[PDB]
From Swiss-Prot, chain B:
Acetylation at Lys-125 markedly inhibits catalysis of cis to trans isomerization and stabilizes cis rather than trans forms of the HIV-1 capsid. PPIA acetylation also antagonizes the immunosuppressive effects of cyclosporine by inhibiting the sequential steps of cyclosporine binding and calcineurin inhibition. Acetylation at Lys-125 favors its interaction with TARDBP. One of its GO terms (cellular component) is extracellular space. One of its GO terms (molecular function) is integrin binding. Changing residue 60 to A: Loss of ability to stimulate MAPK/ERK phosphorylation. This is Peptidyl-prolyl cis-trans isomerase A. Residues 7-163 form the PPIase cyclophilin-type domain. The modification N-acetylvaline is found at residue 2. The modification N6-acetyllysine is found at residues 28, 44, 76, 82, 125, 131, 133. The gene is PPIA. Catalyzes the cis-trans isomerization of proline imidic peptide bonds in oligopeptides. Exerts a strong chemotactic effect on leukocytes partly through activation of one of its membrane receptors BSG/CD147, initiating a signaling cascade that culminates in MAPK/ERK activation. Activates endothelial cells (ECs) in a pro-inflammatory manner by stimulating activation of NF-kappa-B and ERK, JNK and p38 MAP-kinases and by inducing expression of adhesion molecules including SELE and VCAM1. (Microbial infection) May act as a mediator between human SARS coronavirus nucleoprotein and BSG/CD147 in the process of invasion of host cells by the virus. Changing residue 70 to A: No effect on peptidyl-prolyl cis-trans isomerase activity. Reduced interaction with BSG/CD147 and ability to induce leukocyte chemotaxis. Glycans are attached at residue 108.
Length: 135, 165
């Protein structure tokens, strides 16, 4: 496991700073974020300075997708069996209440729960919201 | 006595296995104790008689109490609603401890588990409310029907249950 690189990141920072929120941002975000864990995705978003209102639209989509994920994935009875991972909640997938190894476990269980791919999907939905507002 | 005693007569695919009794610590967690008590006598018109131990994990625990859906997604408290974690004063100190299963903080319903090992990491997430008095060897027998994921190999049911004295 490798936590994102200053370069793929300085790239994203420059994509967002020039191309604004033109549709091009979305394919780029998908490339720059291949195999990312939720924590990597959040560090890429957190690096984006300013564009406060757009960032709040993104957050609103993330919060809404996380709540839907919860709605459609009831919390299994605890206590969790030893050598088992609890199932991820929405907040876990968005990386606010999960750890990186936990993220990694999920991505690596057999079968896997692809938390990175799921959160990335929520992120892209929010990016589409931004793009349709600003362009 | 302040602390009631409850029995479960356990059967395996209808055949009698034996009886397990519990002391309930009403003197420490009276609201959690009383739910389990009342569910064990059937006095509310519903409860544990005929329900099963749907999840049994060897060297961990035996879980039951879902008498509404029989698979871990159901159960209900006598309180008309899931109830809060009363306290976490009592700890999971070894085999025989009786504690509440839940689905997060302050979601106690009817589901419970009997520990078959020390499970200290559960302290502060499950409310401990009783201990096996007699029949620990029956709980030990029950675990032989379990599996790493908890699926049981035969139907382990509470064929009868009630309050002693």
């Amino acid at each position: 496991h490798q936590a994102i690189s200053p370069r793929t990141l300085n790239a994203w920072v420059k994509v967002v700073e020039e191309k604004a929120f033109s549709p091009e941002v979305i394919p780029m975000f998908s490339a720059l974020s291949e195999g990312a864990t939720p924590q990597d995705l959040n560090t890429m978003l957190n690096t984006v300075g300013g564009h406060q209102a757009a960032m709040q639209m993104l957050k609103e989509t993330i919060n809404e997708e996380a709540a839907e994920w919860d709605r459609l994935h009831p919390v299994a009875a605890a206590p969790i069996a030893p050598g088992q991972m609890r199932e991820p909640r929405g907040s876990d997938i968005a990386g606010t209440t999960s750890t990186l190894q936990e993220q990694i476990g999920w991505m690596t269980h057999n079968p896997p729960i692809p938390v990175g791919e799921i959160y990335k999907r929520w992120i892209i939905l929010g990016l589409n919201k931004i793009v349709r507002m600003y362009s | 006595m302040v602390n009631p005693t409850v029995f479960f007569d356990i059967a395996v695919d209808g055949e009698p296995l034996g009886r397990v009794s519990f002391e309930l610590f009403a003197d420490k967690v009276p609201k959690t104790a009383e739910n389990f008590r009342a569910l064990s006598t059937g006095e509310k018109g519903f409860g544990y008689k005929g329900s099963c131990f749907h999840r049994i994990i060897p060297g961990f625990m035996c879980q039951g109490g879902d008498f509404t859906r029989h698979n871990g997604t159901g159960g209900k408290s006598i309180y008309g609603e899931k109830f809060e974690d009363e306290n976490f004063i009592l700890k999971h100190t070894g085999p025989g401890i009786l504690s509440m299963a839940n689905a997060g903080p302050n979601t106690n319903g009817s589901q419970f588990f009997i520990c078959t090992a020390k499970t200290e990491w559960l302290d502060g997430k499950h409310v401990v409310f009783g201990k096996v008095k007699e029949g620990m060897n029956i709980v030990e027998a029950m675990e032989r029907f379990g599996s790493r994921n908890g699926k049981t190999s035969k139907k382990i049911t509470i064929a009868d249950c009630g309050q002693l004295e």
